[PDB]
Protein backbone atom coordinates (compact mmCIF):
# COMPACT_ATOMS: atom_id res chain seq x y z
CA UNK A 1 0.00 0.00 0.00
CA UNK A 2 2.66 2.54 1.02
CA UNK A 3 6.00 1.48 -0.49
CA UNK A 4 5.07 1.61 -4.16
CA UNK A 5 7.17 3.02 -7.02
CA UNK A 6 10.17 1.66 -5.09
CA UNK A 7 12.49 -0.83 -6.75
CA UNK A 8 13.09 -2.73 -3.50
CA UNK A 9 9.46 -3.58 -2.79
CA UNK A 10 9.07 -5.47 -6.06
CA UNK A 11 12.37 -7.29 -5.53
CA UNK A 12 11.19 -8.52 -2.14
CA UNK A 13 7.78 -9.61 -3.41
CA UNK A 14 9.35 -11.22 -6.48
CA UNK A 15 11.74 -13.04 -4.14
CA UNK A 16 9.12 -14.33 -1.71
CA UNK A 17 6.40 -15.17 -4.26
CA UNK A 18 8.70 -17.63 -6.06
CA UNK A 19 7.17 -21.11 -5.73
CA UNK A 20 5.12 -19.87 -2.74
CA UNK A 21 1.38 -20.49 -3.22
CA UNK A 22 0.25 -18.99 0.09
CA UNK A 23 2.35 -15.84 -0.18
CA UNK A 24 1.47 -15.28 -3.84
CA UNK A 25 -2.21 -15.49 -2.88
CA UNK A 26 -1.98 -12.64 -0.37
CA UNK A 27 0.10 -10.52 -2.75
CA UNK A 28 -2.47 -11.01 -5.51
CA UNK A 29 -5.35 -10.50 -3.09
CA UNK A 30 -3.87 -7.24 -1.81
CA UNK A 31 -2.78 -6.04 -5.25
CA UNK A 32 -6.20 -6.69 -6.78
CA UNK A 33 -7.81 -4.93 -3.82
CA UNK A 34 -5.49 -1.96 -4.33
CA UNK A 35 -6.18 -1.95 -8.07
CA UNK A 36 -9.91 -1.71 -7.37
CA UNK A 37 -10.11 0.55 -4.30
CA UNK A 38 -7.53 3.26 -4.93
CA UNK A 39 -7.33 6.68 -6.52
CA UNK A 40 -6.53 6.69 -10.22
CA UNK A 41 -3.56 9.02 -9.72
CA UNK A 42 -1.84 6.21 -7.80
CA UNK A 43 -2.95 3.26 -9.93
CA UNK A 44 -0.02 2.85 -12.33
CA UNK A 45 2.42 1.81 -9.54
CA UNK A 46 0.07 -0.97 -8.42
CA UNK A 47 -0.58 -2.19 -11.95
CA UNK A 48 3.14 -2.12 -12.74
CA UNK A 49 3.87 -4.03 -9.54
CA UNK A 50 1.09 -6.49 -10.38
CA UNK A 51 2.54 -7.04 -13.85
CA UNK A 52 5.96 -7.92 -12.44
CA UNK A 53 4.34 -10.51 -10.17
CA UNK A 54 2.59 -12.15 -13.12
CA UNK A 55 5.86 -12.33 -15.10
CA UNK A 56 7.50 -14.58 -12.48
CA UNK A 57 8.43 -17.62 -14.58
CA UNK A 58 7.91 -20.19 -11.83
CA UNK A 59 5.60 -23.22 -11.81
CA UNK A 60 2.68 -21.21 -10.37
CA UNK A 61 2.63 -18.63 -13.16
CA UNK A 62 -0.53 -19.99 -14.78
CA UNK A 63 -2.32 -20.07 -11.42
CA UNK A 64 -1.28 -16.47 -10.71
CA UNK A 65 -2.48 -15.30 -14.12
CA UNK A 66 -5.79 -17.09 -13.63
CA UNK A 67 -6.32 -15.48 -10.22
CA UNK A 68 -5.50 -12.04 -11.67
CA UNK A 69 -7.55 -12.11 -14.87
CA UNK A 70 -10.56 -13.83 -13.28
CA UNK A 71 -10.04 -13.62 -9.52
CA UNK A 72 -11.13 -15.81 -6.66
CA UNK A 73 -14.55 -17.23 -7.65
CA UNK A 74 -17.81 -15.87 -6.21
CA UNK A 75 -16.08 -12.72 -4.93
CA UNK A 76 -16.18 -10.52 -8.07
CA UNK A 77 -12.64 -9.21 -7.62
CA UNK A 78 -10.19 -9.32 -10.50
CA UNK A 79 -8.96 -7.32 -13.45
CA UNK A 80 -11.93 -8.21 -15.67
CA UNK A 81 -14.31 -7.58 -12.78
CA UNK A 82 -12.84 -4.15 -12.04
CA UNK A 83 -12.85 -3.38 -15.76
CA UNK A 84 -16.55 -4.26 -15.91
CA UNK A 85 -17.47 -2.08 -12.93
CA UNK A 86 -15.47 0.88 -14.25
CA UNK A 87 -16.76 0.83 -17.83
CA UNK A 88 -19.49 3.37 -17.08
CA UNK A 89 -17.93 5.66 -14.47
CA UNK A 90 -14.25 5.95 -13.58
CA UNK A 91 -13.46 4.94 -17.16
CA UNK A 92 -9.81 5.90 -16.61
CA UNK A 93 -9.42 3.05 -14.11
CA UNK A 94 -10.89 0.53 -16.56
CA UNK A 95 -8.54 1.66 -19.32
CA UNK A 96 -5.45 1.41 -17.12
CA UNK A 97 -6.31 -2.19 -16.25
CA UNK A 98 -6.51 -2.88 -19.99
CA UNK A 99 -3.19 -1.10 -20.56
CA UNK A 100 -1.59 -3.41 -18.01
CA UNK A 101 -3.13 -6.45 -19.70
CA UNK A 102 -1.81 -5.47 -23.14
CA UNK A 103 1.67 -5.24 -21.65
CA UNK A 104 1.11 -8.62 -20.00
CA UNK A 105 -0.11 -10.44 -23.10
CA UNK A 106 2.43 -8.99 -25.55
CA UNK A 107 5.36 -9.70 -23.20
CA UNK A 108 4.40 -12.99 -21.51
CA UNK A 109 4.19 -15.97 -23.90
CA UNK A 110 2.78 -18.10 -21.07
CA UNK A 111 0.06 -15.50 -20.58
CA UNK A 112 -0.90 -15.57 -24.24
CA UNK A 113 -1.48 -19.29 -24.44
CA UNK A 114 -3.79 -18.85 -21.45
CA UNK A 115 -5.77 -16.34 -23.49
CA UNK A 116 -5.51 -18.29 -26.74
CA UNK A 117 -6.92 -21.48 -25.27
CA UNK A 118 -9.62 -20.22 -22.92
CA UNK A 119 -12.92 -19.12 -24.40
CA UNK A 120 -14.51 -16.82 -21.83
CA UNK A 121 -11.27 -14.90 -21.33
CA UNK A 122 -11.23 -14.16 -25.05
CA UNK A 123 -14.86 -13.07 -24.76
CA UNK A 124 -13.99 -10.88 -21.78
CA UNK A 125 -10.85 -9.69 -23.55
CA UNK A 126 -12.97 -8.94 -26.61
CA UNK A 127 -15.58 -6.98 -24.67
CA UNK A 128 -12.73 -4.80 -23.44
CA UNK A 129 -11.43 -3.90 -26.89
CA UNK A 130 -14.74 -2.75 -28.39
CA UNK A 131 -15.45 -0.82 -25.20
CA UNK A 132 -12.04 0.83 -25.50
CA UNK A 133 -12.62 1.33 -29.22
CA UNK A 134 -16.08 2.80 -28.67
CA UNK A 135 -14.91 5.00 -25.80
CA UNK A 136 -12.02 6.46 -27.78
CA UNK A 137 -14.01 7.17 -30.95
CA UNK A 138 -16.58 9.25 -29.04
CA UNK A 139 -3.67 13.49 -22.83
CA UNK A 140 -1.51 11.19 -20.71
CA UNK A 141 -4.32 9.38 -18.89
CA UNK A 142 -2.83 9.70 -15.41
CA UNK A 143 -3.94 13.29 -14.69
CA UNK A 144 -7.02 12.04 -12.80
CA UNK A 145 -9.14 14.60 -14.65
CA UNK A 146 -12.78 14.20 -15.70
CA UNK A 147 -12.45 10.38 -16.04
CA UNK A 148 -13.17 10.43 -19.78
CA UNK A 149 -10.74 8.62 -22.07
CA UNK A 150 -8.55 11.33 -23.56
CA UNK A 151 -7.53 10.13 -27.02
CA UNK A 152 -3.85 10.99 -26.45
CA UNK A 153 -1.26 8.65 -27.92
CA UNK A 154 -0.94 6.11 -25.10
CA UNK A 155 -4.56 5.06 -25.65
CA UNK A 156 -4.35 4.92 -29.45
CA UNK A 157 -1.29 2.68 -29.30
CA UNK A 158 -2.88 0.55 -26.57
CA UNK A 159 -6.02 0.10 -28.67
CA UNK A 160 -3.89 -0.76 -31.70
CA UNK A 161 -1.84 -3.28 -29.71
CA UNK A 162 -5.01 -4.72 -28.16
CA UNK A 163 -6.59 -5.33 -31.57
CA UNK A 164 -3.74 -7.50 -32.88
CA UNK A 165 -3.93 -9.62 -29.73
CA UNK A 166 -7.52 -10.48 -30.66
CA UNK A 167 -7.48 -13.60 -32.89
CA UNK B 1 -31.50 12.62 3.01
CA UNK B 2 -34.61 14.04 4.68
CA UNK B 3 -33.69 16.04 7.79
CA UNK B 4 -30.50 17.76 6.69
CA UNK B 5 -31.57 21.41 6.87
CA UNK B 6 -32.42 21.05 10.57
CA UNK B 7 -29.93 21.43 13.41
CA UNK B 8 -30.83 18.41 15.56
CA UNK B 9 -29.17 16.27 12.88
CA UNK B 10 -25.87 18.19 12.86
CA UNK B 11 -25.71 17.67 16.61
CA UNK B 12 -26.25 13.92 16.25
CA UNK B 13 -23.68 13.60 13.47
CA UNK B 14 -21.03 15.71 15.19
CA UNK B 15 -21.61 13.62 18.31
CA UNK B 16 -21.13 10.27 16.54
CA UNK B 17 -18.59 11.24 13.88
CA UNK B 18 -16.25 12.37 16.67
CA UNK B 19 -13.31 9.95 16.46
CA UNK B 20 -15.44 7.18 14.98
CA UNK B 21 -13.66 6.11 11.79
CA UNK B 22 -16.29 3.85 10.24
CA UNK B 23 -19.19 6.16 11.11
CA UNK B 24 -17.41 9.26 9.82
CA UNK B 25 -16.99 7.41 6.53
CA UNK B 26 -20.67 6.43 6.51
CA UNK B 27 -21.75 10.05 6.87
CA UNK B 28 -19.30 11.07 4.15
CA UNK B 29 -20.46 8.18 1.97
CA UNK B 30 -24.05 9.37 2.23
CA UNK B 31 -23.21 13.08 1.99
CA UNK B 32 -20.99 12.59 -1.06
CA UNK B 33 -23.79 10.60 -2.68
CA UNK B 34 -26.38 13.34 -2.23
CA UNK B 35 -24.05 16.19 -3.20
CA UNK B 36 -23.50 14.30 -6.47
CA UNK B 37 -26.71 12.36 -7.19
CA UNK B 38 -29.40 14.71 -5.95
CA UNK B 39 -31.51 17.51 -7.32
CA UNK B 40 -29.65 20.70 -8.18
CA UNK B 41 -31.76 23.09 -6.07
CA UNK B 42 -31.30 21.32 -2.71
CA UNK B 43 -27.52 20.97 -2.42
CA UNK B 44 -27.15 23.82 0.09
CA UNK B 45 -28.78 21.88 2.97
CA UNK B 46 -26.34 19.03 2.25
CA UNK B 47 -23.22 21.09 1.54
CA UNK B 48 -23.69 23.29 4.60
CA UNK B 49 -24.06 20.13 6.69
CA UNK B 50 -20.80 18.84 5.20
CA UNK B 51 -18.81 21.69 6.77
CA UNK B 52 -19.62 20.84 10.39
CA UNK B 53 -18.48 17.31 9.59
CA UNK B 54 -15.14 18.46 8.13
CA UNK B 55 -14.70 21.12 10.83
CA UNK B 56 -14.63 18.51 13.62
CA UNK B 57 -11.14 18.98 15.09
CA UNK B 58 -10.46 15.43 16.23
CA UNK B 59 -7.74 12.91 15.35
CA UNK B 60 -9.60 11.92 12.15
CA UNK B 61 -10.06 15.42 10.74
CA UNK B 62 -7.33 15.09 8.11
CA UNK B 63 -9.00 11.97 6.71
CA UNK B 64 -12.37 13.71 6.42
CA UNK B 65 -10.94 16.49 4.27
CA UNK B 66 -9.06 13.77 2.39
CA UNK B 67 -12.18 11.65 1.91
CA UNK B 68 -14.25 14.62 0.78
CA UNK B 69 -11.96 16.07 -1.87
CA UNK B 70 -10.61 12.82 -3.35
CA UNK B 71 -13.80 10.86 -2.66
CA UNK B 72 -14.11 7.37 -1.21
CA UNK B 73 -12.61 5.27 -4.02
CA UNK B 74 -14.72 3.13 -6.34
CA UNK B 75 -18.26 4.16 -5.37
CA UNK B 76 -18.70 7.78 -4.24
CA UNK B 77 -17.18 10.77 -6.00
CA UNK B 78 -15.45 13.66 -4.25
CA UNK B 79 -15.99 17.39 -4.23
CA UNK B 80 -13.50 17.65 -7.10
CA UNK B 81 -14.95 14.67 -8.98
CA UNK B 82 -18.51 16.02 -9.01
CA UNK B 83 -17.08 19.29 -10.34
CA UNK B 84 -15.62 17.52 -13.37
CA UNK B 85 -18.85 15.56 -13.87
CA UNK B 86 -20.90 18.78 -13.92
CA UNK B 87 -18.89 21.52 -15.64
CA UNK B 88 -20.70 21.07 -18.96
CA UNK B 89 -24.20 20.18 -17.79
CA UNK B 90 -25.72 20.97 -14.38
CA UNK B 91 -23.17 23.74 -13.89
CA UNK B 92 -25.07 24.97 -10.83
CA UNK B 93 -24.06 21.74 -9.09
CA UNK B 94 -20.34 22.47 -9.48
CA UNK B 95 -20.81 26.11 -8.46
CA UNK B 96 -22.48 25.21 -5.17
CA UNK B 97 -19.71 22.68 -4.50
CA UNK B 98 -17.10 25.44 -4.88
CA UNK B 99 -18.99 27.67 -2.44
CA UNK B 100 -18.68 24.87 0.11
CA UNK B 101 -14.98 24.45 -0.67
CA UNK B 102 -14.24 28.19 -0.56
CA UNK B 103 -16.05 28.39 2.77
CA UNK B 104 -14.16 25.35 4.07
CA UNK B 105 -10.66 26.52 3.09
CA UNK B 106 -11.19 30.06 4.38
CA UNK B 107 -12.53 28.84 7.75
CA UNK B 108 -10.47 25.67 8.32
CA UNK B 109 -6.68 25.93 8.69
CA UNK B 110 -6.08 22.17 8.52
CA UNK B 111 -7.93 22.21 5.21
CA UNK B 112 -5.50 24.84 3.93
CA UNK B 113 -2.45 22.72 4.86
CA UNK B 114 -4.03 19.80 2.99
CA UNK B 115 -4.72 21.96 -0.06
CA UNK B 116 -1.26 23.53 0.35
CA UNK B 117 0.95 20.48 0.69
CA UNK B 118 -0.78 17.98 -1.60
CA UNK B 119 0.05 18.92 -5.18
CA UNK B 120 -2.69 16.85 -6.81
CA UNK B 121 -5.44 18.50 -4.77
CA UNK B 122 -3.51 21.75 -5.16
CA UNK B 123 -3.38 21.31 -8.93
CA UNK B 124 -7.04 20.30 -9.28
CA UNK B 125 -8.09 23.27 -7.14
CA UNK B 126 -6.57 25.50 -9.82
CA UNK B 127 -8.67 24.22 -12.74
CA UNK B 128 -11.72 24.76 -10.54
CA UNK B 129 -11.18 28.49 -10.04
CA UNK B 130 -10.75 29.49 -13.69
CA UNK B 131 -13.80 27.46 -14.71
CA UNK B 132 -15.95 29.40 -12.25
CA UNK B 133 -14.56 32.63 -13.69
CA UNK B 134 -15.04 31.65 -17.33
CA UNK B 135 -18.64 30.58 -16.73
CA UNK B 136 -19.27 33.99 -15.17
Curated annotation (Swiss-Prot), chain A:
Q: Where in the cell is it found?
A: Cytoplasm, Cytosol; Cell projection, Growth cone; Cytoplasm, Cytoskeleton, Cilium axoneme
Tissue expression, per UniProt? Widely expressed in embryonic and adult tissues.
Q: What is this protein's expression induced by?
A: By growth factors.
The family annotation for this protein states:
Belongs to the peptidase C19 family.
* Miscellaneous field: Escapes X-inactivation.
Please explain the role this protein plays, according to its UniProt record. Answer: Deubiquitinase involved both in the processing of ubiquitin precursors and of ubiquitinated proteins. May therefore play an important regulatory role at the level of protein turnover by preventing degradation of proteins through the removal of conjugated ubiquitin. Specifically hydrolyzes 'Lys-11'-, followed by 'Lys-63'-, 'Lys-48'- and 'Lys-6'-linked polyubiquitins chains. Essential component of TGF-beta/BMP signaling cascade. Specifically deubiquitinates monoubiquitinated SMAD4, opposing the activity of E3 ubiquitin-protein ligase TRIM33. Deubiquitinates alkylation repair enzyme ALKBH3.
Q: What is this protein called?
A: Ubiquitin carboxyl-terminal hydrolase 9X
Report the source organism.
Answer: Homo sapiens
